[PDB]
Design a binder for this molecule. Sequence first.
Ligand SMILES: OC1([C@H]2CCCN2c2ncnc3[nH]ccc23)Cc2ccccc2C1
Length: 167
Amino acid sequence: VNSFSGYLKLTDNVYIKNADIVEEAKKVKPTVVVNAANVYLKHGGGVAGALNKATNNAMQVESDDYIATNGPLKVGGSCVLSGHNLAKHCLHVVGPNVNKGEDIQLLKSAYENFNQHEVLLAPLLSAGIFGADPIHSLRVCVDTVRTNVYLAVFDKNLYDKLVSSFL
Ligand SMILES: OC1([C@H]2CCCN2c2ncnc3[nH]ccc23)Cc2ccccc2C1
């Protein structure tokens, strides 16, 4: 039993809700919140810009030190950093950005990072400003993630389309 509330249950291990991931994170304080990161951990917009703003830029400060030490992530890769005031940990996961010409096939590799954590709050990877089809992202999520994932979909209209079209 966990403290996630109001989710529609899609599968044995995947749940979905219309919610602002920032506001959800502050309520539940999950062990792991997933950020929709880029390889440089530059948290400018989308989910990343919103999560960083909620940390008063502390996420960005920590991220800049991470990159200075380690260099960029791989597309499809991830790193675990602090969750600051939002969660215990933040799993920064890089899904391919279609608006950069990155291979959509890397989306499965990106979701595989979720399997290293028993429970996560997460957005649909590569959706929104990353340019991929959210219905496809949800399908890859369901077919790749085996751990317990609570998916927050910010757009109410998109949420209904995702639910109504789910196979
Ligand atoms: O869910 C979506 C993702 C990607 C963009 C932002 N976004 C958020 N999700 C959850 N919480 C959030 N808080 C702040 C932002 C945000 C997925 C998606 C895909 C296409 C179009 C709109 C959207 C909303």
